[PDB]
Swiss-Prot record, chains A, B, C, D, E, F:
This is Delta-aminolevulinic acid dehydratase. Catalyzes an early step in the biosynthesis of tetrapyrroles. Binds two molecules of 5-aminolevulinate per subunit, each at a distinct site, and catalyzes their condensation to form porphobilinogen. Homooctamer; formed by oligomerization of dimers. The keyword Endoplasmic reticulum does not apply. One of its GO terms (molecular function) is porphobilinogen synthase activity. Pathway: Porphyrin-containing compound metabolism; protoporphyrin-IX biosynthesis; coproporphyrinogen-III from 5-aminolevulinate: step 1/4. The active site is at K203, K251. Its EC number is 4.2.1.24. Keywords: Heme biosynthesis, Lyase, Magnesium, Metal-binding, Porphyrin biosynthesis.
Length: 326, 326, 326, 326, 326, 326
């Protein structure tokens, strides 16, 4: 940046703000539907639609209902969904075998969506915490610590089962060291040459995941990042890029826009951000109370674009796409 | 940033995360009470405390009551308050003369606080919109446009009145071009050599100010910044620094943490951020609903520190200070 | 850095200095107990406490006494100790076998502290100079030169014995080329996945180690760095990061704050610094003589934080923690 | 900095360390006598040499004695002296008039030295605190605050008196805002076109000045810098360069070597550093006690060179010069 | 670089130039004997000293005479010699076997100097052009092109024979791709752990080598660099650093000071420069004609230091060392 | 610079060197005649050509003879001449009045050339040293010091006289501070809006000017730059650009190519360099002696282009132009 000796009154920054036409001409960023990814909670069974108290307006959907809702998501131009299965309690186990079951919810939903909506991106969640008995992040040693490499073995099986089900993108959310490279080598070995890996690169140990936990039915500091740390996120992303990630993600979203910006600025790679359950809930609640105008939805999403995000995982994706088409 | 060829498994970023002691050693940023500024809403009477509906848990206080609660804020070590008077409708006018009234709420509160707590920082609000007939940002021309230099004349008189009342800091929130230099020159000519000017430098035309209206009882795009614009913020800050600001501020806060980052990175000057009414209300609502843990408060405030903020204007200051103490 | 055309009298840098509250608000760095690591000299035997003339106020402690003193170090919140055994003269030998003895002082002290204070970080010293016959840095060839790779073989055995004793961090202080990578591969091979390596990366051939030598009972230019060289430190650290170090350290401390700064700025990695025996002795002596106020202790430590250090090895850690709690 | 993929064992940084000749070839910085400035304490009488208790080995000297010892300093090639007069208590006053007295100690010493050693640089101290009733930094208001611009008026008269006495360099150590520009303009208007101004630009509110008080016989936070602050030093230096300083100084020295580094790196201007009384005393005390080898003197001074200093104000200048000669 | 708004007449850059003492204080670089390497031409036989018409004052020396002259080079403090054998015509051959002969001139001279002057650095020339029949750079294919990898095989044998003879540094001047890595691996494999490799990294196809060719008794564009190219030199040096060079050199010298500067600035590695035969001859000739003052010698060498060189190969090394001691 | 992991044998930098055509394609810089400025020595008579002993092949020419040879220079496409008058001793004086004489050699030559070759650039020398009694650089005070601002008064009158004579470019070589701004302001006030000012910005106190004295028939350290200093050159250039120079020059040339590089890199402004009399003489002497091939001329000039020069003042301009043509 060079200020170029710009000085009032020769320079008045209000002149460009004076009229809509000039504000439009100098506008640095615009949000479009191309930027939006919808996370969706997927139930077992048939003809199920369940509200989530902590996420007003978001429903968990059985696969038949998901296919029905998706017709309109596609009609709105939403490029991709991110699937989050709501695992039946009885399918949770010590070594998370359900993660790689070809008849698991994520795998079934994937095959169904790929057949019905061939152009719709399906991003699966590579993660053991939907399948472990008490939502722990992976396979535990005798001290209750999440074992890094052993958990990766299971994550790899899971990633392969998602690729087999036809997922165009797998997104590992587990925060094990080196899992991106492990998953990429396994995809490459098995001939899944074009399956994208969207790394959750700089994922923070956060209070903002609370409502998601309520939605899926479920310590973090030994794998997820300390919210205090910014330089560390660069090291996380550099490793995931070296290991072969096609896209890198920051999570949570708005509370870490500084991280989105540093990551985009330093690596110039496809950079994604998750506007998490907590962010959605606090915005929606404030809107319902009449504390915040509905225009806050697009403002919050524009923030991600300005900060350098290429795409945004957001529960507002349908509302935003509606407000963008209109 | 040099990645220095760090690679798994020689590099495992979980090793520093393994134990609390190493997490503490590598922790990049820590919030303290010396980062906190409490905004307070000030009433015109005596023995008055009112609850604000759209800001649950925030009260408007008469000066006598403000003096009482300030005992607690000072005991907690909160360095400064930012005063926001709740102007009676009868004192509102087209010329905003109440802005520089020696017996305006802001002026009376300042005098009372400076006398009772000589070490407590008082930051006054240099702004016409609390004093105009319908909350417009300044003096209007025939077209209803907020005239720049003519509004500045009033803001200067107001800043001088705050300095006369003993405010250590005046904070112009008006977003007229060149007002920082005009206020600084007036303060200098009048001999108020040490009155700090905290510029609201990069202040966005935002939906997040919604609940503030409910607190103080009140076209923004022609003076406040387009949320889409990041480069433009650097030009705003550069001008305010040239014009004599001792500190510069980004507003709103969490939706603009990338802006905080860029401003701190490029200017290396004292950088402040406002966690605005809508950010407070969003968080408080989710906490009250039991959707989010109370730990999000410290998490939200830590973000500002990590992003580069030196100080945070936050309605959570007392709560935060009590959590930091214990 | 962009100066932003800031000019007296519009800019007066004394305004922020005018009051405690504003000095606090703009304060760029603060020292906390999270930043402190205490080095401790450990004797053989029982019920031993020996003063060190060249390090007033520092005592060498047998393990029983160390456990007793540690209760209070932990109570003060000191996150970690760095152990320096005082090796009995008769246990020194040509090929430094004592370095890896499971019944060596460092190994015994480690097991005792890990059991008694499970949350306290134990940083061991990976070094052959406590175990060689005349304090030489490693294994000598027939010319009296310290052989690089042969010394690393012994250092690796030692590092493994520390990991076996339960040390969470091993800190190689030997300045052999490539020892960080050698030690990391051996830790990885043996399943010590989470043992941290705190590299003494840029360690200078220094006169400031004199009192430490007195404390432990003991040429340098062929392995330790020439104090003239700054660019070279970057090459040292880049290699240690590539080789898998979790933290990198500069030593001595205050005489090399420029190096701390370059290292933090260039690599953005966890950066440590040793305020060595000589630095402690000259400060303590000057304080005892009434030449320097006690406030110099916290000033010297604040310098490390400002310079970019994440943690500081300092014999003042107890005094500083006391003065920070109070 | 490009690490250029250097890796062990292809890269072994010990190879250049192997022999004295290669160490000499790669040596990045060398101290010489042309880096050294000797501060001297000057008495008001004749045939006077006094030992300073808190600065062992440093003497206060009458002008006749100063002239004698200067023969030795000149023979050693020390380029400049910095004069610090020891003002008799009777000459101290609220208006600090002695500061510009044509027969003040500083003015008499300057005239005598310029005549006797025409090639020797004389750096005078532009400062009010040697002349004020109780060593306060400048003229006080009713509240006991050091008034900026009014103190500057006195400093300007003083700088002019030093120039009239023939000083080649005036060095304002007062830390008033804008004094460099005010002194430069006065010097220019009076025709002292070639009088250099060595600004004390980044001078910290430090405990390290303790022994200086014992030498000269004498709220600092309101003009001197907070030790925590690094970015702020760049703003101080930028202003002094704009205002006409020929050289800029960091003070104290070794506790602020990161500041020396940053200042040299960003401005590429002649950069000076003061190894202050407390740094001297710390080192001298440890040497006298036999805790540190006398080689620490050259090591401490080499640090300044490596950090970026062009010149060092040091009480060790004569000792250093004798060591460099032999 | 930030100009810091420095402006005449507040800034007059002549003030620092006014007096010797201040010019000395701000002087950015100084040449010392530590910077000098003497190239020497070595004859077969005994009691030989031959003048070189194109290099006035430079003599070729048999080994006995070289030992005699070296006593004084060592007395002057010259840290190292670079040896250039004058190969007997009858020892030149198709496959340059003389390069690795343990009884070759370079090998014999090396053993003799290492025994007699153990502290003197001996830099040998790894090159096939002294041993090929018509001074071609290496082994020719059937088109007369210098084969890269086959020539490296011979260069490696030669480098090993120099290490065996005791050379502390080998300097490959051949400009084959990858020879630095090949030579380093062979040195490492054979246990020559500390033998330095001083790469001729960015060596240009130059007319300035003419007199050297006369001195040793002897197309270039297919291996030596085009004098037009600057970016290319960075690629050359990056590769040599990756391949394990301890020092990197630019050649010729003064006509490529821009390259010295870029190389030092970009890599921050030990950077050397050869002031070649042509540079020496044109300076010496101009001095002998009375066209240039003798002071041009030190000026030319100071240029290398200012440009960023750590050491200089120069036929003026004895004259310069004399003029530096005196 | 990103090395982009280029490694042998995948990267072989000899591949582009293999054939003339690829060498031509990758060639980074090319000298042309549009880079060349010819300095010429101008005599006061008619029918005069004199050989300069210390500049073999360079002639001093009367204006009539200059007009004749200029036919050839123009036919070769040389864009500009730099005039250096050879002032008769009778016209030399303490006040240097001949400098602005409308019938001075420089003024007469300019008028004659502008009329005869309207497209040929004429660069006059703004300098007092051709006109002062003993070749001193300007007007002297009682101490023999070259007074800055008083010399500038004469230089301004001279620059105006050159502009009146029709010079398109005035080039002040005097090294007084602020003279560029003073000349620019005078030219502007007099309406010479398009007269270019080519500042000698970074002109070193050099031995390389020796033969120039023999050409024109004639303490430098107090105005010309110390050869040791590089950072200082950037401050000199920044000032001249601020003061209105259209182009800036480094002098001497080849000994300061790092300075050319830094100046072009930092300012990106039209950058010129003087291959001075001593550089010419060194090269010419070696060529005449048969020590160096005539190809060194183009090699020396290509260096300037590669270093960043836009134009070169060179006594080889005619030779170079003839070589470039053929
Ligand atoms: Cl004030
Ligand atoms: Cl003067
Ligand atoms: Cl014109
Ligand atoms: Mg990771
Ligand atoms: Mg503005
Ligand atoms: Mg190392
Ligand atoms: Mg200042
Ligand atoms: Mg190469
Ligand atoms: Mg100049």
């Amino acid at each position: 940046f060079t200020p170029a000796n710009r000085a009032y009154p020769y320079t008045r920054l209000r002149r460009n703000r004076r009229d809509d036409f000039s504000r439009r001409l100098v506008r640095e960023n615009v949000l479009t539907v191309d930027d939006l990814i919808l996370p969706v909670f997927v139930l077992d069974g048939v003809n199920q639609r369940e509200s989530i108290p902590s996420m007003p307006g978001v429903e968990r959907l059985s696969i038949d209902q998901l296919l029905i809702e998706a017709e309109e998501w596609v009609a709105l131009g939403i490029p991709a969904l991110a699937l989050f299965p709501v695992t039946p309690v009885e399918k949770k186990s010590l070594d998370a075998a359900e993660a790689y079951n070809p008849e698991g919810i994520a795998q079934r939903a994937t095959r169904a969506l790929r057949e019905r909506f061939p152009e719709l991106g399906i991003i699966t969640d590579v993660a053991l915490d939907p399948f472990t008995t008490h939502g722990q992040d992976g396979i535990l040693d005798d001290d209750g610590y999440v074992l890094n490499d052993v958990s990766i073995d299971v994550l790899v099986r899971q990633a392969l089962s998602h690729a087999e089900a036809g997922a165009q993108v797998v997104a590992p959310s587990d925060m094990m060291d080196g899992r991106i490279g492990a998953i990429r080598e396994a995809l490459e070995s098995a001939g899944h040459t074009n399956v994208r890996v969207m790394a959750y690169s700089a994922k923070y140990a956060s209070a903002y995941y609370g409502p998601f936990r309520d939605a899926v039915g479920s310590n973090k500091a030994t794998y997820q990042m300390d919210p205090a740390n910014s330089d560390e996120a660069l090291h996380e992303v550099a490793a995931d890029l070296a290991e072969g990630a096609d896209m890198v993600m920051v999570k949570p979203g708005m509370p870490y826009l500084d991280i989105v910006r540093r990551v985009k600025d330093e690596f110039r790679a496809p950079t994604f951000v998750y506007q998490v359950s907590g962010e959605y809930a606090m915005h929606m609640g404030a809107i319902q109370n009449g504390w915040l105008a509905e225009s806050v939805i697009l403002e919050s999403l524009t923030a991600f674009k300005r900060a350098g995000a290429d795409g945004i995982l957001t529960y507002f994706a349908k509302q935003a796409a509606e407000q963008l088409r209109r």
